Structures are given as structure tokens and as C-alpha cells.
Amino acid sequence: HLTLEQISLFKQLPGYWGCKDLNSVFVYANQAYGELIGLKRAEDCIGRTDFEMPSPTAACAAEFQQQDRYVIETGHSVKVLDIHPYPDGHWHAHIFTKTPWRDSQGKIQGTIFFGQDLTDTAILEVGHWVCRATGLSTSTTLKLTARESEVLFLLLYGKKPQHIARVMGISIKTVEGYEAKLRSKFGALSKDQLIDLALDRGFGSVIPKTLLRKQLSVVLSDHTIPK
Amino acid sequence: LTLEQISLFKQLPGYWGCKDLNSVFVYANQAYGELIGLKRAEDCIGRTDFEMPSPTAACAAEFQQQDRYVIETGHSVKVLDIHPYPDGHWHAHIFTKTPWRDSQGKIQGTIFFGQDLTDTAILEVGHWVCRARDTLKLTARESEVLFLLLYGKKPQHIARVMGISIKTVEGYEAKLRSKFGALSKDQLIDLALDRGFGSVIPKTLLRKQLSVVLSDHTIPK
Numbered sequence: 001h002l003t004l005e006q007i008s009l010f011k012q013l014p015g016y017w018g019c020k021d022l023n024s025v026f027v028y029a030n031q032a033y034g035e036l037i038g039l040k041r042a043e044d045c046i047g048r049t050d051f052e053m054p055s056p057t058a059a060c061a062a063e064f065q066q067q068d069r070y071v072i073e074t075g076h077s078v079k080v081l082d083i084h085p086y087p088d089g090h091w092h093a094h095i096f097t098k099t100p101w102r103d104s105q106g107k108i109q110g111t112i113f114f115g116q117d118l119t120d121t122a123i124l125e126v127g128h129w130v131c132r133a134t135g136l137s138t139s140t141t142l143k144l145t146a147r148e149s150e151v152l153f154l155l156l157y158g159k160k161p162q163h164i165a166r167v168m169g170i171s172i173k174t175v176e177g178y179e180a181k182l183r184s185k186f187g188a189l190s191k192d193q194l195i196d197l198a199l200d201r202g203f204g205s206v207i208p209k210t211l212l213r214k215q216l217s218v219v220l221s222d223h224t225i226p227k
Numbered sequence: 228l229t230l231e232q233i234s235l236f237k238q239l240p241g242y243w244g245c246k247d248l249n250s251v252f253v254y255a256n257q258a259y260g261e262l263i264g265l266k267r268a269e270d271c272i273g274r275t276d277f278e279m280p281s282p283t284a285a286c287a288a289e290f291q292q293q294d295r296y297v298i299e300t301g302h303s304v305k306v307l308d309i310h311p312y313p314d315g316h317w318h319a320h321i322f323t324k325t326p327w328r329d330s331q332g333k334i335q336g337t338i339f340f341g342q343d344l345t346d347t348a349i350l351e352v353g354h355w356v357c358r359a360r361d362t363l364k365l366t367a368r369e370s371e372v373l374f375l376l377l378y379g380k381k382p383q384h385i386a387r388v389m390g391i392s393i394k395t396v397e398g399y400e401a402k403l404r405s406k407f408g409a410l411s412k413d414q415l416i417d418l419a420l421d422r423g424f425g426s427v428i429p430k431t432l433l434r435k436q437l438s439v440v441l442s443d444h445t446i447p448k
């Protein structure tokens with residue numbers, strides 16, 4: 001059995017986290033998540049779905065549940081970029097980790113969600129260094145528009161044009177125009193080479209500022225470093 | 228706690244736990260125990276970082292210096308940790324360290340929360356790692372020295388990280404100053420930040436043992 005001292009760690013572990021059952025009905029949410037989602041007491045989440053929270057995040061509950069069902073049906077964990085207006089009147093950005101929740105015999109019985117704030121330390125501007133065979137190099141242009149920057153960021157995290165068009169609220173053909181502009185600016189011969197050239201220049205380290213005021217919930221491809 | 232809450236607590240992601248004011252472990256989750264070589268995670272309790280069955284203990288003094296800073300300031304810090312582990316492999320993590328408070332709000336220790344270094348974890352700390360004339364060119368070792376200088380490592384600490392002599396580090400330091408046109412270490416760091424080097428983690432550091440604070444943040448009252 002846990003001591004009260006250890007239970008205080010359960011109460012104080014940072015982040016925004018909880019678990020849901022197989023129908024994405026909340027089973028627990030910590031106090032930080034409850035306050036973020038507009039509730040006075042986080043216990044008031046229990047028995048509700050994402051559609052039923054007093055929060056604009058509920059506009060994206062279908063996407064949350066599609067992510068949950070993917071975790072449940074494959075057993076894979078995902079990382080989700082979540083950008084929403086919240087009942088406190090501010091836009092927030094988080095990465096939510098979603099993993100299977102298992103019972104005592106190892107069977108999947110729901111999902112665990114674990115969110116961390118994206119701070120200004122993650123919204124830097126792109127530098128001017130380039131990966132080399134050894135070390136790095138810099139000069140002494142790749143100036144991108146807002147839409148171009150948003151398309152590039154999503155491409156670098158594994159998103160297809162159909163995903164990007166749905167995230168940005170534009171047509172697939174419009175995304176292809178931005179892809180072509182990006183390929184020209186980077187001098188890339190292919191979409192795959194565009195990704196390589198952009199990654200070697202630090203474009204993966206920067207969330208475009210205009211993305212921080214677009215409501216979205218999108219799984220980001222995630223791989224260990226190094227690999 | 229209810230049965231569901233205990234189950235959730237045992238399965239929350241990450242590598243985490245808490246330590247008292249002397250950095251003696253009070254709790255570690257199953258993932259941290261397994262990572263550190265203690266499959267029965269309760270075996271962590273009552274030990275310090277010096278007493279774990281892991282090559283990480285070579286950096287226990289640095290872990291405790293970080294803990295004391297969190298305890299004395301109330302700030303949170305994010306730490307880049309790269310260590311060999313008892314499974315025989317190098318692992319890189321971001322460890323976030325936060326004050327642990329008692330029922331009356333007094334700091335009683337630290338909470339540590341580690342995440343595997345992945346694409347999204349490094350995005351969260353605003354850095355990036357490389358995968359596989361008028362131009363300024365850094366070599367692998369120059370970039371290692373510049374990175375460690377950027378985050379406050381002494382030449383002797385840099386020598387220990389890179390396994391080289393302190394005279395060799397001073398040679399790299401002098402080469403960096405000429406390429407950047409700096410006349411001192413402070414001008415060098417200032418010029419490297421202006422060109423955006425503050426977001427780089429040299430890829431060769433992923434197989435060198437280090438524990439480096441990347442950021443320190445005020446927690447709002």
C-alpha cells in the first residue's frame with residue numbers, strides 16, 4: 001500500500017493527465033487538467049466524455065476519440081499536438097502523450113493521457129546552422145510566409161497532404177501549392193528531399209507562431225533520438 | 228486512492244519519482260526502477276543517486292546539485308541527461324525537476340520526471356539534433372566544446388565529458404574564438420547565441436556522459 005507521502009506525489013506530479021475507459025469516458029483527471037478544462041473540481045470530469053466538458057476543446061472531441069481508439073486497437077502510444085482556446089480565455093498549446101491503460105491481466109481497458117505545456121522555449125525562431133558530415137556550418141534566403149511555415153512544420157512531423165488540408169482548413173490542392181513553393185525555396189527535387197533539407201537546418205525545432213492560434217489536434221510522428 | 232487510481236499511478240508514462248531534501252529517494256515508478264537496474268522499484272527507496280546499480284551514479288553529485296538548486300530557488304529546471312545504463316545501452320532523456328511540497332506548502336524535496344529523448348521531447352525544449360570561404364564551419368569536437376561552454380561547463384568539466392585534457396579544451400576554446408571573431412569567452416557565447424547556436428545539440432554528445440541544465444523557469448505563485 002502507498003503511504004500518504006507517496007500519494008502526495010500522485011497529487012503533485014506535474015502535467016495535465018488522467019485516464020478514460022474504452023468509450024473515452026473519463027475515469028480520472030488530475031487537478032491541473034480539471035482546472036485547465038474549466039472545472040472547479042476535477043472529480044466533475046468522471047463519467048463525462050470529451051464532448052461534455054465546458055470547454056472549446058470539446059469542438060475537437062471526435063479527433064480526441066479517434067486518437068484514443070487508435071491507441072486501444074493497436075496498442076501503440078501516440079504524441080498529439082493540441083492547440084485550443086480554453087475557458088480561461090487564453091490559447092494553450094500542449095503535447096499530449098496517449099498510451100494504453102491496462103488491467104491487472106494486461107488487457108487494454110482504456111487510455112492514459114498525459115499533457116505538457118509548450119512554452120516559449122519551444123517557439124524560438126529558426127537559426128542559420130546546417131548539418132554537415134561532421135559538425136555544423138553557418139553563413140557570413142529561406143524566408144517563409146505564414147502558411148508556408150505551417151505546411152512545412154506538419155510535413156516534417158510525418159503528415160500527408162490530406163491530413164494537412166484538414167488541419168489547416170484548406171483544400172488538398174492548396175496544400176500542394178504550398179508544398180511546391182517550399183520545394184522551390186529549398187531547391188528540393190522531391191518531397192522527401194525537402195524534408196531532409198529542412199531537418200538539416202533546424203526547421204523541426206520550431207512551431208510556427210501562427211499555428212498557436214489555430215485550433216487543432218494532430219498526431220505527430222515521433223522517433224527516438226538517435227535513430 | 229481507488230483501485231483505478233492506483234492502476235493509473237502505476238502506468239503513467241515517463242521515468243519519475245521524488246526525493247527528500249537530501250535527495251534520498253522516497254518513490255520511483257516502475258519504469259524508472261527498470262531503467263536504473265532495480266526491477267523491484269521499491270528498492271530505490273532510501274537510496275541516493277550514489278547508490279543506484281547504474282553507471283549514472285558517476286554523475287550523482289551533479290544530480291544533487293540540480294536538486295539543491297530546485298530546493299533553494301523554487302524553480303523548475305529541465306536537464307539533458309545522457310548516460311550509459313545497466314542494460315548496456317546509452318539513453319538520452321530530458322529530466323524535469325520540480326519542488327515537492329508538504330501539506331503546508333513548504334518545500335520538502337524534489338519531483339523528477341524523465342522523458343526519452345524523442346523528436347517531440349526535443350521540440351518541447353526548443354532544440355534539434357542532426358541525424359546522419361564566407362561560411363563558418365565547426366568540427367565535431369569544436370561544436371561539443373561550444374555547446375558545453377554555452378551552458379556553463381568549466382574547462383575541467385568539459386575535459387571530463389569529452390575524456391580529454393584541459394589543455395586540449397583550451398585549444399578548442401581558442402579556435403572557436405577566432406572563427407567567431409570573439410576576444411573573450413563571454414563574447415564567444417554572446418556571438419554564438421546571436422547566430423542561433425542555442426538550439427543545437429551536437430549529435431556526437433549522444434554517446435558521452437553528461438547532465439546539463441538546459442533551462443530554469445519560475446513557477447508562478
Ligand SMILES: Cc1cnc(O)c(C)n1
Pocket residue numbers: 050057064082096113
Ligand atoms: C485537451 C485534450 C486533448 N485531447 C484529449 O484527449 C484530452 C482528454 N484533452
Ligand SMILES: Cc1cnc(O)c(C)n1
Pocket residue numbers: 276283290308322339
Ligand atoms: C537518470 C537520472 C538523472 N537525474 C536524476 O536526478 C535522476 C533521479 N535520474
